[PDB]
């Protein structure tokens, strides 16, 4: 006979979903500004339409996304192998190879073959092909069902070839599916360890050894992925809110008057711009107003130089004596003004140069000659009991705001600063006014030293541990607490600061007014420095490096306060115990989760329908009744549902039965399927308007065998509702096979196919003594036994033949002694072929690949390479018919036991 698939079909295998991921440069010389590049591509094996998308990028023209260009690829005859995405291991499924015939008026006769794969269990074995001949009408298709059972996990491959009779047209499709084990995906938490290197660990570092994945429900020989999640935990600290700029609108003052009155108007405008620049409240205040107040600050500095005396000092008039306070206060305002507007620096340093030559005794005392005509601007220094110490502190603070600007100009400035600091420490512990301890508490905390008792006296003079208060006008106490806030922000202490700022905000002092020069200037210089230097966070800076023995490198991540990599995941398919080294400041969380395949119940099949399929030979060659009963598993009746019926090979449904079924009230068989021919109709869909949840809805129709075949593949019935193909239920049917399943032998989720031959089919008369010795002395033949059949445990899945080992002719890899028992397994189709009788003796040999269980409970499989020969008894050899066999078997034993196998 002619096998038409002798066409040397190289099956189609390249079916990418996307390709042509290429980069081309249009270097060809342009014609009217358009370069044309010709590009030779090789189309893939898919029979579809490709959509090709180009995007160009040009230095002078930019980005351009082309319109999509389509390419349709087709043939007049081809296979479409409708493979699912995944199949569960050892679960029987029905795939569909759809064969298309787009000839106009030619009816094709095709020989189509499912190729054998050892990874699958089908009717195609190593010695038997699954070939069949089908008829395809023109401009039609035909679905060829194939029943397979995948036997090993991973990417496994299905190949179907076809070649047409009387035309030189052939095709083959070789696609692949994933074989997933019977379990369900599940995730478990391996470890949650909190990283804190300045609290855990030693010497600044924290090493955390992670155990590997502690799974005990895992399906054996399956992949697990461990996901390492390094994530920084941000922390925040409470900060007091800034003063609302709507309450500060009255501080924009046009400065006017003489040498003291000009500084009265200049003060609330310089300090408001300085506070609003630091808090950045100009958006909620008016951005246009910033430049107008900036010109008033320039107007203040311009008119103040008119009262700067030529001795680089400051007085109220040009004929007035100079002041120690007013010169120090112009130094205090002009130094804070440099950050926004500058003109001349020798005016600032010239006033500091006069402040030490004329008003610095070597005691370190600043003494006031008092030509300050306005006692309003003086603030708490007016009406002070220790007016000597409080003024030494005032001028010293003025020298430090101009120290960073006048370090090279006035080289004698650190001498007077040390002398002024020496006078403060001696009489610090003798003060009794809260204002003097506050202003000389900032004057000794600025770049200098306050002793342990001096810091203790500075903190214990705060009544209610939040405010500095003395008998007197409250603008002296608000000024004093503003000095004590700048002290606590100069010492970088922040445990005493929050009750101090809270009291300043609850005072609701917004500056401005009569006598408010010190109180407006200090309460917004101190609250600006609180917004300049503030703990918003706790400084997160973790350098966490992970040393994994799964690789040859250490992956690190600098988890700053920067929000670029707050969290970073590191996947590692290798399941090994690794080390997490974490050092630095701040806190962080580490999460390690491993996904895996958990062996649970394999009950995902038929979760929405019950389906019972029976095939009965009830009475043109063969005629059986196919009965399908189905029932929905819900609270209500299901909606429109689909019965995808597949015929067993060689069978076709009765056409008069389908026309009666289509006439039903809740059933629909389409006119397309009723008008089909009797042959080439191996699939059928009966549509159901409803299926009951209360009772089984049953239909039945006869099927006729129009073609006799040696091997009948089981048909299949599939039920699903229209809105969900995934919630389906498939039952197989086949006469002489249990529940329509192909013959397989399974143990602990490992099956092998049993569709092979029953045993070695060589006749007992065509075999000689030399033929028995040549076959049994092969190295593949592991065991050679003389057995005695004790019991035959009949079952529906497979027959078990318990053999007593009568003689160990050749001992294999199974240490079995004489008298012991081993079970020989064969499928139920071989029960009539083997013809094994109890208490009879047999010569048996086979391969070591036919072993089954573990070594304590080792079973043998009677496969295609297993020799089973009847051994007649000693009295039975007296017949002339058994003389040839008994002479061979007795010689076969003496040749193997006494002399063994050479080579």
């Amino acid at each position, epitope marked *: 006979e002619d096998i*038409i698939a*002798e*066409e*040397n079909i190289v099956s189609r295998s390249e079916f990418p979903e996307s390709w042509l991921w290429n980069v081309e440069d249009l270097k060809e010389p342009p014609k009217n500004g358009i370069s044309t590049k010709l590009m030779n591509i090789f189309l893939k094996d898919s029979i579809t339409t490709w959509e090709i998308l180009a995007v160009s990028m040009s230095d002078k023209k930019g980005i351009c996304v082309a319109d999509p260009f389509e390419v349709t690829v087709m043939q*007049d005859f081809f296979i479409d192998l409708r493979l699912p995405y995944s199949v569960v291991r050892n679960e029987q499924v029905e795939i569909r190879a759809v064969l298309y015939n787009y*000839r106009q008026n*030619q009816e094709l006769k095709v020989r189509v073959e499912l190729l054998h794969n050892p990874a699958f269990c089908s009717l195609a074995t190593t010695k038997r092909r699954h070939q069949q001949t089908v008829t395809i009408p023109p401009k039609s298709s035909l679905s060829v069902p194939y029943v397979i059972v995948p036997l090993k996990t991973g990417l496994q491959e299905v190949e179907v070839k076809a070649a047409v009779y*009387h*035309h*030189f*047209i*052939s095709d083959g499709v070789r696609k692949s599916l994933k074989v997933v084990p019977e379990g369900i995906r599940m995730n478990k938490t391996v470890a949650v360890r909190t990283l804190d290197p300045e609290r855990l660990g030693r010497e600044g570092v924290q090493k955390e050894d992670i155990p590997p994945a502690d799974l005990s429900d895992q399906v054996p020989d399956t992949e697990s992925e461990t996901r390492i999640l390094l994530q920084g935990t941000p922390v925040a600290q409470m900060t007091e809110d800034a003063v609302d700029a709507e309450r500060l609108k009255h501080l924009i003052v046009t400065p006017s008057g003489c040498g003291e009155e000009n500084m009265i108007g200049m003060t609330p405008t310089v300090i408001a711009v300085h506070y609003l620049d630091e808090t950045e409240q100009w958006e909620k205040f008016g951005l246009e107003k910033r430049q107008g107040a900036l010109e008033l600050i320039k107007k203040g500095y311009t008119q103040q130089l008119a009262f700067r005396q030529p001795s680089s000092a400051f007085a109220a008039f040009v004929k007035r004596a100079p002041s120690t306070w007013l010169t120090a206060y112009v130094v205090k305002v002009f130094s804070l003004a440099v950050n926004l507007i500058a003109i001349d620096s020798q005016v600032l340093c010239g006033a500091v140069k006069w402040l030490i030559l004329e008003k610095q005794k070597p005691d370190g005392v600043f003494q006031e000659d008092a030509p300050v005509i306005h006692q309003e601007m003086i603030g708490g220094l007016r009406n002070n009991n220790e007016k000597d110490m409080a003024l030494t502190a005032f001028v010293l603070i003025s020298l430090q705001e101009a120290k960073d600007i006048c370090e090279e100009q006035v080289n004698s400035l650190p001498g007077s600063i040390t002398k002024a600091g020496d006078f403060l420490e001696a009489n610090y512990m003798n003060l009794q006014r809260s204002y003097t301890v506050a202003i000389a508490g900032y004057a000794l905390a600025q770049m200098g030293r306050l002793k342990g008792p001096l810091l203790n006296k500075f903190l214990t003079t705060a009544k209610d541990k939040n405010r500095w208060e003395d008998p007197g006008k409250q603008l002296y106490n608000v000024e004093a607490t503003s000095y004590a806030l700048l002290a606590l922000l100069q010492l970088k202490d922040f445990d005493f600061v929050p009750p101090v700022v809270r009291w300043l905000n609850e005072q609701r002092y917004y500056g401005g007014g009569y006598g408010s020069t010190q109180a407006t200037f200090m309460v917004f210089q101190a609250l600006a420095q609180y917004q300049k230097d503030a703990p918003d966070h706790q400084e997160l800076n973790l350098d966490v490096s992970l040393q994994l023995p799964s690789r040859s490198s250490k992956i690190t991540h600098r988890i700053h306060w920067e929000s670029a990599s707050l969290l970073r995941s590191e996947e590692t398919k290798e399941n090994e115990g690794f080390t997490v080294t974490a050092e630095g400041k701040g806190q962080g969380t580490l999460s390690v989760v491993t996904m895996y395949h958990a062996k649970a119940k394999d009950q995902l099949t038929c979760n929405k329908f019950d389906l019972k399929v029976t095939i009965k030979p009830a009475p043109a060659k063969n005629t059986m009744i196919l009965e399908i009963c189905t029932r929905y598993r819900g609270d209500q009746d299901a909606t429109m549902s689909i019965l995808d019926i597949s015929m067993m090979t060689g069978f076709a449904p009765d056409t008069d039965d389908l026309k009666q079924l289509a006439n039903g009230v809740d059933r629909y068989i389409s006119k397309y399927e009723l008008d089909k021919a009797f042959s080439d109709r191996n699939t059928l869909i009966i549509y159901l308007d409803k299926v009951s949840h209360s009772e089984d809805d049953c239909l039945a129709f006869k099927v006729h065998q129009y073609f006799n075949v040696e091997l009948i593949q089981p048909g299949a019935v599939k039920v699903y509702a229209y809105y969900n193909l995934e919630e389906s239920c498939t039952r197989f049917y086949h006469p002489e096979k249990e529940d329509g399943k192909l013959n397989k032998l399974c143990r602990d989720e490992l099956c092998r196919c049993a569709e092979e031959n029953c045993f070695i089919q060589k006749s007992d008369d065509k075999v000689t003594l030399e033929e028995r010795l040549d076959k049994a002395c092969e190295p593949g033949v592991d065991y050679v036994y003389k057995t005695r059949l004790v019991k035959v445990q009949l079952s529906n899945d497979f027959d078990e033949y318990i053999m007593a080992i009568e003689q160990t002719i050749k001992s294999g890899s199974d240490e079995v002694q004489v008298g012991q028992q081993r079970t020989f397994i064969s499928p139920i189709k071989c029960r009539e072929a083997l013809k094994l009788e109890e208490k009879k003796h047999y010569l048996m040999w086979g391969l070591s690949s036919d072993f089954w269980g573990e070594k304590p409970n080792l079973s043998y499989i009677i496969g295609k390479d297993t020799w089973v020969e009847h051994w007649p008894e000693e009295d039975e050899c007296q017949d002339e018919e058994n003389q040839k066999q008994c002479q061979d078997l007795g010689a076969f034993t003496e040749s193997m036991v006494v002399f063994g196998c050479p080579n």
Partner: nanobody
Framework: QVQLVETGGGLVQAGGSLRLSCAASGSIFSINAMGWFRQAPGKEREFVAT????????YYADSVKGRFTISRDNGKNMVYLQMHSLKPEDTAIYYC????????????????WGQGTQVTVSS
């Protein structure tokens, strides 16, 4: 496209033999049908022999059924027609033709034909 050139023809005796070689322009691979056709003087163009794409399937006309043998070399882009046990009724112009594979025993599915060669078998 692709065109063909026929060689190997000439004058031969009645009982002798000769083989005709067909040269292809492009690569003859992936072309399913490769056929030989002949046209006797006074007669119509009739079918002689087709070969498979791989060479494993052939078809012959009943007049030349056990006498001719068609072969091809897909690596050399060549088709051959070995003509044995000649008859005087075989005198014809022999055409080599490229086909699609559909209905390979008829000329209706051959779109690329050759020049032809004269094979005279005198009595």
């Amino acid at each position: 496209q692709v065109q063909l050139v026929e060689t190997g023809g000439g004058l031969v005796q009645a009982g002798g033999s000769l083989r005709l070689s067909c040269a292809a322009s492009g690569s003859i691979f992936s072309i399913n049908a490769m056929g030989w056709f002949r046209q006797a003087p006074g007669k119509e163009r009739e079918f002689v022999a087709t070969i498979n794409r791989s060479g494993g399937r052939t078809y012959y006309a009943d007049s030349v059924k056990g006498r001719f043998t068609i072969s091809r070399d897909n690596g050399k882009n060549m088709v051959y027609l070995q003509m044995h046990s000649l008859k005087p009724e075989d005198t014809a112009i022999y055409y080599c033709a490229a086909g699609t594979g559909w209905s390979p025993q008829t000329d209706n599915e051959y779109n690329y034909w050759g020049q032809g060669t004269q094979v005279t078998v005198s009595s």
